[PDB]
Amino acid sequence: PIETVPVKLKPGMDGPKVKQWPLTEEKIKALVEICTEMEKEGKISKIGPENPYNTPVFAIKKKDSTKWRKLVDFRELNKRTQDFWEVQLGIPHPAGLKQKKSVTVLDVGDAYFSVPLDKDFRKYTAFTIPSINNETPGIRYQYNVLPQGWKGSPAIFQCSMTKILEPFRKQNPDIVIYQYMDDLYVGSDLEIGQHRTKIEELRQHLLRWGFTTPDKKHQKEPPFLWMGYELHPDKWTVQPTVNDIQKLVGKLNWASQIYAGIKLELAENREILKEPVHGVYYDPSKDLIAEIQKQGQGQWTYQIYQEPFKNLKTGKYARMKGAHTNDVKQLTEAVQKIATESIVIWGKTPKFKLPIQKETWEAWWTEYWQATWIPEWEFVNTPPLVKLWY
Amino acid sequence: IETVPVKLKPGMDGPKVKQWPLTEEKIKALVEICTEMEKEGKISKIGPENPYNTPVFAIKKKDSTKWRKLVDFRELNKRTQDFWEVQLGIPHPAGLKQKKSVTVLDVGDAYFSVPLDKDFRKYTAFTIPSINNETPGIRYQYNVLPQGWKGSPAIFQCSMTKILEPFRKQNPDIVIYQYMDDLYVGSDLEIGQHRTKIEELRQHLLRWGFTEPPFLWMGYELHPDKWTVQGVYYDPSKDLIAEIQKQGQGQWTYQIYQEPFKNLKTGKYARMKGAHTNDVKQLTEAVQKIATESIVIWGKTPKFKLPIQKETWEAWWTEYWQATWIPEWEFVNTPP
Numbered sequence: 012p013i014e015t016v017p018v019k020l021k022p023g024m025d026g027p028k029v030k031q032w033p034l035t036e037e038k039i040k041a042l043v044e045i046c047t048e049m050e051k052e053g054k055i056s057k058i059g060p061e062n063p064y065n066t067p068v069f070a071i072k073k074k075d076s077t078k079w080r081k082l083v084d085f086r087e088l089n090k091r092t093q094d095f096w097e098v099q100l101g102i103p104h105p106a107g108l109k110q111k112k113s114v115t116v117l118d119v120g121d122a123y124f125s126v127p128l129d130k131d132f133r134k135y136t137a138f139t140i141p142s143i144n145n146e147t148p149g150i151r152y153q154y155n156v157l158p159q160g161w162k163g164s165p166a167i168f169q170c171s172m173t174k175i176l177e178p179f180r181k182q183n184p185d186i187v188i189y190q191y192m193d194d195l196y197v198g199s200d201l202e203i204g205q206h207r208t209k210i211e212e213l214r215q216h217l218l219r220w221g222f223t224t225p226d227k228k229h230q231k232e233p234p235f236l237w238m239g240y241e242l243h244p245d246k247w248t249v250q251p252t253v254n255d256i257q258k259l260v261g262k263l264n265w266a267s268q269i270y271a272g273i274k275l276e277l278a279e280n281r282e283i284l285k286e287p288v289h290g291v292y293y294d295p296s297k298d299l300i301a302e303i304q305k306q307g308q309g310q311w312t313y314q315i316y317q318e319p320f321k322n323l324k325t326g327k328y329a330r331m332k333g334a335h336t337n338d339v340k341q342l343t344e345a346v347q348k349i350a351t352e353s354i355v356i357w358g359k360t361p362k363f364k365l366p367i368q369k370e371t372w373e374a375w376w377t378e379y380w381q382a383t384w385i386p387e388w389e390f391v392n393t394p395p396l397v398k399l400w401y
Numbered sequence: 402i403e404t405v406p407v408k409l410k411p412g413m414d415g416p417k418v419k420q421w422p423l424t425e426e427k428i429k430a431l432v433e434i435c436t437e438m439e440k441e442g443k444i445s446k447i448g449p450e451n452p453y454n455t456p457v458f459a460i461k462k463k464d465s466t467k468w469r470k471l472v473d474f475r476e477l478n479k480r481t482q483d484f485w486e487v488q489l490g491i492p493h494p495a496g497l498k499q500k501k502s503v504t505v506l507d508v509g510d511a512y513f514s515v516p517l518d519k520d521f522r523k524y525t526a527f528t529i530p531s532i533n534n535e536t537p538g539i540r541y542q543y544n545v546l547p548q549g550w551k552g553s554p555a556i557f558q559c560s561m562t563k564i565l566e567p568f569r570k571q572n573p574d575i576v577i578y579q580y581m582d583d584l585y586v587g588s589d590l591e592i593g594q595h596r597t598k599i600e601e602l603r604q605h606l607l608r609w610g611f612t613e614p615p616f617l618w619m620g621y622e623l624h625p626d627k628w629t630v631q632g633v634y635y636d637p638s639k640d641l642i643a644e645i646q647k648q649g650q651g652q653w654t655y656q657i658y659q660e661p662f663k664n665l666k667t668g669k670y671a672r673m674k675g676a677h678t679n680d681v682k683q684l685t686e687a688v689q690k691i692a693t694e695s696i697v698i699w700g701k702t703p704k705f706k707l708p709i710q711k712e713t714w715e716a717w718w719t720e721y722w723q724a725t726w727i728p729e730w731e732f733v734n735t736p737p
């Protein structure tokens with residue numbers, strides 16, 4: 012139903028005619044049954060001898076299942092297809108951005124097989140399954156939909172997803188939609204009934220565009236535990252020799268986000284882990300406030316919050332390994348780093364509450380040789396002085 | 402009309418550059434501009450089959466009701482064809498420096514009128530990002546001659562000369578120079594006469610264009626003779642460099658030269674407005690002034706050496722930029 016995306020191969024390159032070798036009889040019968048079912052569903056098509064291209068195929072026994080899955084080695088074709096649009100995107104911030112009252116999840120497992128493929132590129136997906144004992148030529152097929160394991164299937168699927176869901180987001184700017192693994196997560200601030208009607212409308216929309224989402228309600232629990240972050244409608248939490256030190260350092264770094272106080276330091280780590288914590292979500296109407304604490308020895312701890320006692324985020328900044336580094340220089344690097352992180356995560360740089368005297372920064376600028384970015388800030392009386400001396 | 406064939410430098414692929422994150426209001430303004438452009442048919446969406454990327458961001462000119470979109474075609478300009486020595490266009494007049502008055506004008510809409518070659522439109526794709534990495538950005542490509550690309554003036558040369566003949570024939574001393582969108586009108590007369598002639602040329606252009614933008618009519622004045630006079634020679638082949646340094650109490654000192662220890666030009670700048678408290682604002686204004694001065698004096702915008710941290714400059718240079726183009730800059734982290 013959706014329009015196909017034209018795609019070609021790298022110039023000066025030809026289709027895969029790689030030789031294949033015979034397989035087992037039960038495996039070939041399973042492959043025949045799977046191919047017949049796909050032909051019934053339209054995901055596959057028959058091609059005559061005019062197409063000389065051939066690609067390997069093999070069956071893998073599913074874990075604790077009678078049926079075997081078909082897998083086609085696309086390693087040779089992955090170097091034939093043109094380059095696709097790859098995006099170097101970092102993992103989204105731990106849900107710090109915005110809040111939705113109610114959340115539902117849906118399944119899009121079959122959607123990977125509902126996207127039509129380009130007509131010019133179909134004949135390159137040719138694979139053969141030889142008959143038993145090869146007394147007669149085997150059966151040759153090519154895909155009419157996106158094939159699994161192909162290089163360009165994820166990018167095409169993502170673009171199709173975005174183009175399908177653009178109008179729905181246009182009509183309802185309040186409702187947020189994300190796609191994690193095979194689960195489409197929808198979040199809304201509206202009431203239960205309105206959210207239900209909107210979800211049914213979205214399901215009918217996706218059916219109209221051909222993508223399949225089951226009627227049966229998904230069994231996923233409210234704690235989604237996505238990317239090591241326990242996610243709840245109101246709050247969020249972090250996950251509860253030569254190689255042993257790196258593992259411990261990594262496990263200590265992740266726990267420093269919402270379990271504030273992470274710095275014989277094993278005892279303090281165990282003590283702070285015993286205290287449950289939580290983090291509220293960002294609110295757009297209220298402005299952001301970031302507070303700084305000088306822990307010492309080149310370490311700073313920053314807390315981002317809207318209102319006091321409700322932290323949006325917590326983090327730690329450490330000085331760069333050099334011969335000498337001034338205290339105010341570390342402070343400025345920390346504040347600009349927090350500003351950049353807030354720009355990425357929320358979009359608006361926050362105002363700061365720093366334990367520094369106003370004239371100190373003015374003297375610093377009069378003395379500094381580079382150019383630094385300084386936002387408006389309000390001094391707060393805190394025991395750390397960080398006067399910078401002289 | 403029939404389109405003009407353009408190509409690339411052989412052995413060179415298209416540009417792919419990462420897009421830096423932007424704030425909320427900048428993204429809203431960019432979305433509005435791009436929606437208007439797509440309604441006008443000068444911008445079209447693309448799928449994932451195009452692996453070429455180019456940054457885009459919004460600036461704000463003085464007295465702007467809406468931001469202005471700006472694209473960083475530096476990678477393409479480096480990687481596009483040698484289309485400007487065989488089709489060089491017009492050599493820069495040597496009269497720009499001696500006159501007392503020169504006024505800048507914007508002619509971007511005339512560029513937007515004429516269409517581009519089809520088999521090149523893939524290389525001018527840009528991407529508007531999203532906040533919190535929530536969704537992939539929105540991708541676009543140009544259907545007409547783009548702004549900030551040096552191929553547009555080279556292609557438009559003929560139409561530009563066709564409409565510039567009467568004014569130049571009126572009096573040979575008043576000269577016109579083109580550089581990207583910028584159109585410099587140079588005269589050595591009184592301010593009133595210069596302004597009247599500038600307005601005459603403005604509605605001359607408006608009368609030629611069948612399709613009165615407030616941004617188009619806005620321009621600023623520059624006085625080359627006000628500068629110090631005190632280079633011995635200049636080599637067009639070599640690329641020149643301009644170094645910026647910070648002097649106390651919001652002062653800045655810039656040196657333009659092709660070879661070290663031989664200053665082609667030296668200058669100082671300062672403005673004690675009170676909104677100067679941002680160092681990046683003062684640096685951006687200084688760098689724009691230096692680049693405009695070099696463009697009046699010489700053909701091309703120079704290379705720049707910025708005394709600033711990489712990430713701070715990268716994050717806080719966009720909002721204070723006001724020019725129509727982007728120079729090439731390099732960061733220095735060693736004190737003098």
Ligand SMILES: N#CCCc1ccc2c(S(=O)(=O)n3nc(Nc4ccc(C#N)c(Cl)c4)nc3N)cccc2c1
Nearest residue numbers: 103108109110111114187189191196235237243244535
């Ligand atoms: N698995 C899994 C998780 C699914 C998910 C959802 C959204 C994401 C967004 S997001 O843009 O759609 N988004 N998120 C929130 N916060 C929020 C509030 C309440 C609940 C509940 N219950 C939830 Cl799951 C999220 N606010 C906005 N705007 C962005 C990035 C990454 C995401 C991953």
